[PDB]
Scaffold this active site. Structure first.
Site, PDB file in Angstrom:
ATOM      1  N   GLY A 187       2.700  -0.746   4.185  1.00 43.01           N
ATOM      2  CA  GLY A 187       3.030   0.721   4.256  1.00 43.01           C
ATOM      3  C   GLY A 187       4.393   1.067   3.914  1.00 43.01           C
ATOM      4  O   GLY A 187       4.590   1.030   3.037  1.00 43.01           O
ATOM      5  N   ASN A 188       4.794   2.105   4.414  1.00 46.64           N
ATOM      6  CA  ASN A 188       5.951   2.577   4.842  1.00 46.64           C
ATOM      7  C   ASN A 188       7.011   1.798   3.917  1.00 46.64           C
ATOM      8  O   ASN A 188       8.250   2.374   2.806  1.00 46.64           O
ATOM      9  CB  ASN A 188       6.385   3.647   5.312  1.00 46.64           C
ATOM     10  CG  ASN A 188       5.994   5.276   5.761  1.00 46.64           C
ATOM     11  OD1 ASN A 188       4.462   5.606   4.627  1.00 46.64           O
ATOM     12  ND2 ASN A 188       6.049   6.146   5.973  1.00 46.64           N
ATOM     13  N   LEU A 227      -0.668  -6.577   4.191  1.00 49.39           N
ATOM     14  CA  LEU A 227      -0.243  -5.413   3.790  1.00 49.39           C
ATOM     15  C   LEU A 227       0.615  -4.015   4.255  1.00 49.39           C
ATOM     16  O   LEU A 227      -0.130  -3.173   5.158  1.00 49.39           O
ATOM     17  CB  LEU A 227      -1.968  -4.770   3.990  1.00 49.39           C
ATOM     18  CG  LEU A 227      -2.888  -3.152   3.275  1.00 49.39           C
ATOM     19  CD1 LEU A 227      -2.596  -3.597   1.881  1.00 49.39           C
ATOM     20  CD2 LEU A 227      -4.138  -2.724   3.865  1.00 49.39           C
ATOM     21  N   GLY A 286       1.305   4.034  15.403  1.00 49.88           N
ATOM     22  CA  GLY A 286       1.429   5.410  16.455  1.00 49.88           C
ATOM     23  C   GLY A 286       1.034   5.771  17.544  1.00 49.88           C
ATOM     24  O   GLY A 286       0.878   7.559  18.352  1.00 49.88           O
ATOM     25  N   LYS A 297       0.100   4.281  -0.706  1.00 53.39           N
ATOM     26  CA  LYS A 297      -0.569   5.597  -0.371  1.00 53.39           C
ATOM     27  C   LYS A 297      -0.320   6.560  -0.661  1.00 53.39           C
ATOM     28  O   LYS A 297       0.091   6.096  -2.144  1.00 53.39           O
ATOM     29  CB  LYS A 297      -0.752   5.400   2.071  1.00 53.39           C
ATOM     30  CG  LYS A 297      -0.619   5.176   2.888  1.00 53.39           C
ATOM     31  CD  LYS A 297      -0.139   4.609   3.841  1.00 53.39           C
ATOM     32  CE  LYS A 297      -0.811   3.558   4.562  1.00 53.39           C
ATOM     33  NZ  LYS A 297      -0.379   3.840   6.624  1.00 53.39           N
ATOM     34  N   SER A 341       2.521  -2.521  11.572  1.00 57.29           N
ATOM     35  CA  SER A 341       4.053  -2.113  11.506  1.00 57.29           C
ATOM     36  C   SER A 341       4.558  -3.409  10.924  1.00 57.29           C
ATOM     37  O   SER A 341       5.253  -4.014  12.020  1.00 57.29           O
ATOM     38  CB  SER A 341       4.761  -1.025  12.542  1.00 57.29           C
ATOM     39  OG  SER A 341       4.347  -0.315  12.077  1.00 57.29           O
ATOM     40  N   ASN A 348       1.171  -0.685  -0.070  1.00 60.80           N
ATOM     41  CA  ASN A 348       0.465  -0.307  -0.102  1.00 60.80           C
ATOM     42  C   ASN A 348       1.388   1.447   0.012  1.00 60.80           C
ATOM     43  O   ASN A 348       1.207   1.680   1.054  1.00 60.80           O
ATOM     44  CB  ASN A 348      -0.626   0.136   0.949  1.00 60.80           C
ATOM     45  CG  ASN A 348      -1.619   1.191   1.089  1.00 60.80           C
ATOM     46  OD1 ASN A 348      -2.031   1.813   0.820  1.00 60.80           O
ATOM     47  ND2 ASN A 348      -2.711   1.171   2.888  1.00 60.80           N
ATOM     48  N   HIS A 381      -9.490   1.537   4.834  1.00 58.92           N
ATOM     49  CA  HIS A 381      -8.879   1.421   5.713  1.00 58.92           C
ATOM     50  C   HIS A 381      -9.167   2.112   6.474  1.00 58.92           C
ATOM     51  O   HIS A 381      -9.832   3.869   6.619  1.00 58.92           O
ATOM     52  CB  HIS A 381      -7.556   1.488   4.603  1.00 58.92           C
ATOM     53  CG  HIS A 381      -6.079   2.017   5.024  1.00 58.92           C
ATOM     54  ND1 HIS A 381      -5.718   2.954   5.762  1.00 58.92           N
ATOM     55  CD2 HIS A 381      -5.075   1.359   4.953  1.00 58.92           C
ATOM     56  CE1 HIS A 381      -4.690   3.013   6.201  1.00 58.92           C
ATOM     57  NE2 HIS A 381      -4.312   1.693   5.357  1.00 58.92           N
ATOM     58  N   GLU A 385      -6.128  -3.994  11.204  1.00 62.15           N
ATOM     59  CA  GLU A 385      -5.320  -3.471  11.579  1.00 62.15           C
ATOM     60  C   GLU A 385      -5.393  -2.890  13.059  1.00 62.15           C
ATOM     61  O   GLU A 385      -6.216  -2.677  13.472  1.00 62.15           O
ATOM     62  CB  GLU A 385      -5.736  -2.131  11.345  1.00 62.15           C
ATOM     63  CG  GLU A 385      -5.666  -2.237   9.375  1.00 62.15           C
ATOM     64  CD  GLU A 385      -6.058  -0.722   8.331  1.00 62.15           C
ATOM     65  OE1 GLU A 385      -7.564  -0.680   8.461  1.00 62.15           O
ATOM     66  OE2 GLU A 385      -5.033  -0.386   8.512  1.00 62.15           O
ATOM     67  N   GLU A 423      -7.318   5.299   7.758  1.00 64.83           N
ATOM     68  CA  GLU A 423      -7.112   6.477   7.209  1.00 64.83           C
ATOM     69  C   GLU A 423      -8.567   6.812   6.886  1.00 64.83           C
ATOM     70  O   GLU A 423      -8.745   8.566   7.502  1.00 64.83           O
ATOM     71  CB  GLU A 423      -5.624   6.611   6.060  1.00 64.83           C
ATOM     72  CG  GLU A 423      -5.191   6.877   7.501  1.00 64.83           C
ATOM     73  CD  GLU A 423      -3.763   5.993   6.416  1.00 64.83           C
ATOM     74  OE1 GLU A 423      -3.512   5.940   5.163  1.00 64.83           O
ATOM     75  OE2 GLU A 423      -2.331   5.806   6.852  1.00 64.83           O
TER      76      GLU A 423
END
Lengths: 246, 246
Positions: B230-231, B228, B169, B10, B209, B8, B93, B163, B95
């Protein structure tokens, strides 16, 4: 000031239909240095559209993010659009204010982000029937314009668009004269807040229901500089609407 | 069950960064009949990305509309995606649930629209720090899955993703055993509502993460069928994360 005619395809089209439609538009003979003609396809149809449309036409996207690049799944930022050479972005369309939940604050943040990245913006606003029937149109428009007006740096790069919500879907019709009075009022607010020279160069587009039978009367009004067309821009006859402004 | 690793991206990328990245991804030799590898680029990069990646990689988009074709400026419908041969779509998602007010009802509508148009769906859900601290994990998850599992299925075409919002965070960290405890509970819900054969074939991914250091320990757990990412999916090292599932 230059006339600006825009085609907002909204959520419509297939690869074939888009092919045929752009084939009809390309048959029109006009000069891109006199008149601004912009087509706004669905995001996933952008490359396909740009490729088919001759260079006379400009292209843009129907929405942009209020955030920059980062953890925001589903969004397209201004910097991404700029890297892709996308020239225009629609901001504040009523369908986004209504179905999704965009506010005047979202509008100002999206504008600020587009300008910060050197993108051109087409910003929408307008009042509903309830606000109109109680004589609050000007109060509503003043509030909506006042939300982002101080961010405008170059008055050739931001195009305003008035959407007569009171007429849209209500089974009512806005006459050119009724539209002209609002446009005149909007130009006056920009003058009083920014300056005369600034008010003189900025384009204010109609944005209501435009067709081949009423486009001429609309463009003839002194404070109506063009239109953001909906349903009629999905038809080959859209060329006749462009012709009304040349 | 076949493992499933999804990237993903993003709201990130440039035409050039994507070119460099897809090049490194293409070096990896894997058998797509044994492992599902999918990449989710920004909508305006989808075509560019699909042409750059070899056929062994599948592609998809980060969001679809709950509405159909029509007057919904800014939206992409399931029908349009189908015409473009887009294979997967992400739905729900966090977000989008957080910044764009998407609800359980929306998730249900979008899944219905996607399955109706022959698109494969990656559906996300999870509980927050507060819900976790109040010992509401199981109740919350049960309600979220029940919002869409509701007899809308072919168990190879819908992928579930957990998730851990309580660790995103917050300064808190989820261990592979904590992640496995939730995946087990999720699979049970599918078992109680659809049947054991159905529960055993559906994939359930981890959407917390994921990096090169913990991927192997996570994929080893019984009810974790992939991730899935991310960064980390925006780095060349992403291939090492794909290898942990081979």
């Amino acid at each position: 000031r230059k006339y600006f005619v825009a085609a907002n395809w909204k959520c419509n089209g297939t690869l074939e239909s888009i092919k045929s439609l752009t084939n009809s538009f390309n048959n029109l003979d006009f000069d891109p240095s006199k008149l601004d003609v912009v087509v706004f396809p669905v995001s996933v149809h952008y490359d396909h559209t740009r490729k088919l449309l001759q260079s006379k036409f400009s292209t843009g996207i129907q929405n942009v993010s209020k955030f920059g690049n980062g953890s925001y799944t589903g969004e397209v930022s201004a910097e991404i659009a700029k890297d892709l050479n996308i020239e225009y972005v629609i901001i504040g369309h009523f369908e986004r204010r209504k179905y999704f939940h965009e506010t005047d604050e979202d509008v100002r943040e999206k504008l600020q982000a587009s300008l910060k990245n050197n993108l051109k913006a087409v910003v929408c606003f307008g009042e509903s029937l309830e606000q109109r029937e109680q004589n609050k149109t000007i109060e509503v428009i003043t509030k909506q314009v006042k939300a982002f007006v101080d961010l405008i740096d170059n008055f050739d790069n931001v195009i305003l668009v008035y959407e007569p919500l009171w007429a849209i879907g209500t089974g009512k019709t806005a006459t050119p004269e009724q539209a002209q009075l609002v446009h005149k009022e909007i130009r006056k607010i920009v003058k009083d807040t920014c300056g005369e020279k600034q008010a003189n160069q900025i384009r204010i587009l109609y944005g209501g229901s435009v067709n081949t039978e009423n486009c001429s009367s609309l463009i003839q009004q002194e404070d109506i500089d063009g239109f953001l067309v909906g349903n009629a821009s999905l038809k080959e006859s859209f060329v006749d609407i462009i012709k009304s402004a040349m």
